Structure 1
Amino acid sequence: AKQSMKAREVKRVALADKYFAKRAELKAIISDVNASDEDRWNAVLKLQTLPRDSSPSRQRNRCRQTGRPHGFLRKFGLSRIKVREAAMRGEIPGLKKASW
């Protein structure tokens, strides 16, 4: 990946950490039943003025060593190529080739 895409990801994670509690509060108001029906409207109008990059759904998982956006595994934090390289070198405890 280019050096700009990784910077994009870092920025996204930072903003999403910054604005976590406010969004939870506003969404709780909107979702809860038996509200004033004006507080609901104001909360909807206020939830869309926060930065777009503060939503945790704008994030994409990338390989921690290369930045690849495809072929990602959650247990290891890497893509298939790097997983295989480390596994054959012997750097992932407990992992080995399987047959049955």
Structure 2
Amino acid sequence: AKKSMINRELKREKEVAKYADKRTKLKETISDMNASDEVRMDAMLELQALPRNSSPVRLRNRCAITGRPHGYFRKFGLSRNMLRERVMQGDVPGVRKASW
């Protein structure tokens, strides 16, 4: 993909990493049934006031090499295009052709 899109994903994941723990504690606070109603509502308001890219839902994982937003595999971290080349070269351990 474009260098702009690769860097935009990088900066989109930087905020997620920066606000990972605050979101965890805040989610526990809002989900606690022992917390006061106003307390959990205020915590929810703070969650909605957090920066937009902080949420891990705007993250779209892409190929490490090419930054391809489609054809991604979680196990390998590569798109289909580069995954096929690496597998056929043999650089991916354990992976081989399938026939049954």
- 1:39-54 map, 5 Å: 39-54=39-54
Aligned twin of 1:8 = 8
Q: Which runs of 5+ in 2 are unaligned?
A: none
Aligned twin of 1:25 = 25
Q: Deviations over 1:59-88 (max 9, x none)?
A: 001011111111111111111111111122
**Higher Cα Rg, which structure:** 1
Give the letter for the 2:81 counterpart: I
Runs of 4+ that moved beyond 3 A: none
1:42 shift after superposition: 1.3
Give the letter for the 2:26 counterpart: L
1:45 shift after superposition: 1.6
CA RMSD of aligned residues (A): 1.3
- 1:77-92 map, 5 Å: 77-92=77-92
Give the letter for the 1:24 counterpart: T
1:95 shift after superposition: 2.0
Give TM-score scaled by structure 2 length.
Answer: 0.89
Give the letter for the 1:58 counterpart: R
Identity of aligned residues (%): 61
Determine the C-alpha separation between the residues in 2 that align with 1:54 and 1:12. 7
Give the letter for the 2:45 counterpart: L
1:34 shift after superposition: 3.1
Q: Deviations over 1:15-65 (max 9, x none)?
A: 111112211222212111132221122112211121111111110010111
Give TM-score scaled by structure 1 length.
Answer: 0.89
Give the letter for the 1:38 counterpart: E
Determine the C-alpha separation between the residues in 2 that align with 1:96 and 1:27. 43
Q: Which runs of 5+ in 1 are unaligned?
A: none
